[PDB]
C-alpha cells in the first residue's frame, strides 16, 4: 500500500525543524562526503579556470528521521530534501557552479531506517586553477577543488571522507574532456582554515595535470626552426645577388616578428617570460645575426 508510507512520511516531518542541525546540543554533525567525477571538463588556460562535472555525495546521521516500516531504505524524491536539514557545502574556489534541473532536479535522498541519510547532487563546478606558466608549454599543474561549510564552524559541522581518502574522489574511465592536458591523478587532503567568523573544516582535492606539447611544437617550434633554416640559406647565395639576400633577410625577420606575435596571443596576458618566449627570442636573435 501507499497510505502506510504517506503516514510514515507525515510522521517524519511532523515536528521537524529544518533550521536546526541534527544534534544541535550534544553532538558535532559528521558529514561523510564523496565525489564521482563523471567528466573532467576542459581546462580553460585563458581564465585560469577548469570545469568538472561531479556526483557530489554527502551522508550524515539524523536521529529525528528514524522510522519502522516494511521497507528499510526510503528512496524518496528530490523534493523531500528541501523539508529537512542538509549541509550547506560550498566550494571555496568555485566561480560559477550550476546544479542541473533537467528534467527534474538532479538530486537524490535515501533515508535509512536508523536515520542515516544520503544526499547526492549532480554539479558542474567551474573552479579556479592558479597556474605558474613559467615552463609553458612544458608545465604541469595541480588544480585544486576546496569545499567546506558555510555558516557552520568546526565545533558544529565536521567533514570527512566516506572511504579511505585515497579512494574517495573517483574519476570515470571515459570521463576525460581534456584535449590539451593529461590528467595524472587526484590527491585529497583535509585541513582547518581560520577566519574572522570562526574555524572551518576545509576538504581539498588536487587534480594533477600535464600539458601535451604536440600542438605547440607543430605550430610554434617547427615554424620557428624552418624560419631559421630559411634565413640561414641566405649564406650559400653568392655575394653578387644583393636583392635576393636582402629579401631573404627582411622576409625572415618579419616572419619571426609575426610568429612571435601569434605565439604570444594564445597565452594569458602574463608579465613574465615563458620557455616558448625564450625559444622565439633566440630564433629572432639568430635571424638578426
Amino acid at each position, epitope marked *: 500500500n501507499t497510505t502506510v508510507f504517506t503516514r510514515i512520511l507525515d510522521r517524519l516531518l511532523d515536528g521537524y525543524d529544518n533550521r536546526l542541525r541534527p544534534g544541535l546540543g550534544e553532538r558535532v554533525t559528521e558529514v561523510k562526503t564523496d565525489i564521482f567525477v563523471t567528466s573532467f571538463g576542459p581546462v580553460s588556460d585563458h581564465d585560469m579556470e577548469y570545469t568538472i562535472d561531479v556526483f557530489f555525495r554527502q551522508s550524515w*546521521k539524523d536521529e529525528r528521521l528514524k522510522f519502522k516500516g516494511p521497507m528499510t531504505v526510503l528512496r524518496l524524491n528530490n523534493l523531500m530534501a528541501s523539508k529537512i536539514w542538509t549541509p550547506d557545502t560550498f566550494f571555496h574556489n568555485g566561480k560559477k557552479s550550476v546544479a542541473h534541473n533537467m528534467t527534474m532536479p538532479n538530486k537524490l535522498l535515501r533515508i535509512t531506517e*536508523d536515520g*542515516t541519510l544520503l544526499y547526492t547532487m549532480r554539479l558542474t563546478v567551474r573552479a579556479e586553477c592558479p597556474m605558474h606558466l613559467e615552463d609553458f608549454p612544458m608545465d604541469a599543474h595541480a588544480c585544486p577543488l576546496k569545499f567546506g561549510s558555510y555558516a557552520y564552524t568546526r565545533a558544529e559541522v*565536521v567533514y*570527512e*571522507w566516506t572511504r*579511505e*581518502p*585515497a*579512494r574517495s574522489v573517483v574519476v570515470a574511465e571515459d570521463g576525460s574532456r581534456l584535449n590539451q592536458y593529461d590528467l595524472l591523478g587526484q*590527491t*585529497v*587532503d*583535509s*585541513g582547518i582554515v581560520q577566519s574572522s567568523t570562526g574555524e572551518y573544516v576545509v576538504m581539498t582535492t588536487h587534480f594533477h595535470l600535464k600539458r601535451k606539447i604536440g600542438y605547440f611544437v607543430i605550430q610554434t617550434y617547427l615554424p620557428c626552426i624552418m624560419t631559421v633554416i630559411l634565413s640561414q640559406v641566405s649564406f650559400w647565395l653568392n655575394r653578387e645577388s644583393v636583392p635576393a639576400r636582402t629579401v631573404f633577410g627582411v622576409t625572415t625577420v618579419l616572419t619571426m616578428t609575426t610568429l612571435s606575435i601569434s605565439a604570444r596571443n594564445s597565452l594569458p596576458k602574463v608579465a613574465y617570460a615563458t620557455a616558448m618566449d625564450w625559444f622565439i627570442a633566440v630564433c629572432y636573435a639568430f635571424v638578426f645575426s
Partner: antibody
Framework: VQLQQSGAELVKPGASVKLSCTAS????????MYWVKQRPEQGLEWIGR????????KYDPKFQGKATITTDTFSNTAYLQLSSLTSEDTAVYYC???????????WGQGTSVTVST | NIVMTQSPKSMSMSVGERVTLSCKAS??????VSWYQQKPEQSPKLLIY???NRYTGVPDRFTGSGSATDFTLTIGSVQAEDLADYHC????????FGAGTKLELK
C-alpha cells in the same frame, strides 16, 4: 567507547580460531572496524577492515584468504576468523574502530593466540 | 602499499629534555598520519590524530608536525611515564604502521 575482545586461545597448528570483539557504547554501523596483529616486540600490522553497514571487507594482500572478517549488528560484534594458521602467527590481535581523521582512536585489549602442540 | 620509515630505531633520553621522532612516508599522505603510544603490556592509545591534532586527554607536551611525506612528533618536558613505544601510521590509504621507537630512560 568500550571494546571487549575475547580471551586467550591455545589452538593447534592447522585449525581455525574465531576471535570476537564486542563494541559497547556505539553502533558499529557508523564506523569501520580494523583488525591489527602484533608479534612480540615488533611493529603493528594491519589485517583488514570491514564496513558493518554493507559488509564490504578489505584485507592486507598478505592476509587475503587466510583471514576473514564478519560482523553481527544485533550484538554489535566483529568476528575475525583465521582459516588456516601455521606456527608463526602467535601474535596479539587487537580490534580498533576508526576515529575522527581516519585514525584508530579506540582499540580493544588483545587476544594473545598461541599455536603449539 | 605505503610504507612508513620511522626513526630512530631506539633512543634513550633523560627526564625533562626535548625529544623528537621522525616518520617518513614513501608515497603521498596528506595529513592522515597518526601517532599512537603503546605502553608495555597494554593496547595502543591514540596520541595525535591527523598531523598536529592532540587527542582528547593528551598532555600539551606532545606536538605533531605534518607535511606530504615527512612527519614529526616532538615531546617537550618529558616526564617519567612517557617510556613506551611510539608508532606512526598513515591512513590516506589502507592503514600501514611504522616499526616504532623504543623510548628509554638513562
Amino acid at each position: 567507547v568500550q571494546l571487549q575482545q575475547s580471551g586467550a586461545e591455545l589452538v593447534k597448528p592447522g585449525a581455525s580460531v574465531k576471535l570476537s570483539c564486542t563494541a559497547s557504547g556505539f553502533n558499529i554501523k557508523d564506523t569501520y572496524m580494523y583488525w591489527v596483529k602484533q608479534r612480540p616486540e615488533q611493529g603493528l600490522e594491519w589485517i583488514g577492515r570491514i564496513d558493518p553497514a554493507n559488509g564490504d571487507t578489505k584485507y592486507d594482500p598478505k592476509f587475503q584468504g587466510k583471514a576473514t572478517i564478519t560482523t553481527d549488528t544485533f550484538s554489535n560484534t566483529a568476528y575475525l576468523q583465521l582459516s588456516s594458521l601455521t606456527s608463526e602467527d602467535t601474535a596479539v590481535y587487537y580490534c580498533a574502530r576508526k576515529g575522527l581523521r581516519w585514525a584508530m582512536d579506540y582499540w580493544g585489549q588483545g587476544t594473545s593466540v598461541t599455536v603449539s602442540t | 602499499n605505503i610504507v612508513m620509515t620511522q626513526s630512530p630505531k631506539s633512543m634513550s633520553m633523560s627526564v625533562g629534555e626535548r625529544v623528537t621522532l621522525s616518520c617518513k612516508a614513501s608515497e603521498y599522505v596528506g595529513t592522515y598520519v597518526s601517532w599512537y603510544q603503546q605502553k608495555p603490556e597494554q593496547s595502543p592509545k591514540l596520541l595525535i590524530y591527523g598531523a598536529s591534532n592532540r587527542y582528547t586527554g593528551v598532555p600539551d607536551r606532545f606536538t605533531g608536525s605534518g607535511s606530504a611525506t615527512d612527519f614529526t612528533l616532538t615531546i617537550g618536558s618529558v616526564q617519567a611515564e612517557d617510556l613506551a613505544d611510539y608508532h606512526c601510521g598513515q591512513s590516506y590509504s589502507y592503514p600501514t604502521f611504522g616499526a616504532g621507537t623504543k623510548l628509554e630512560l638513562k
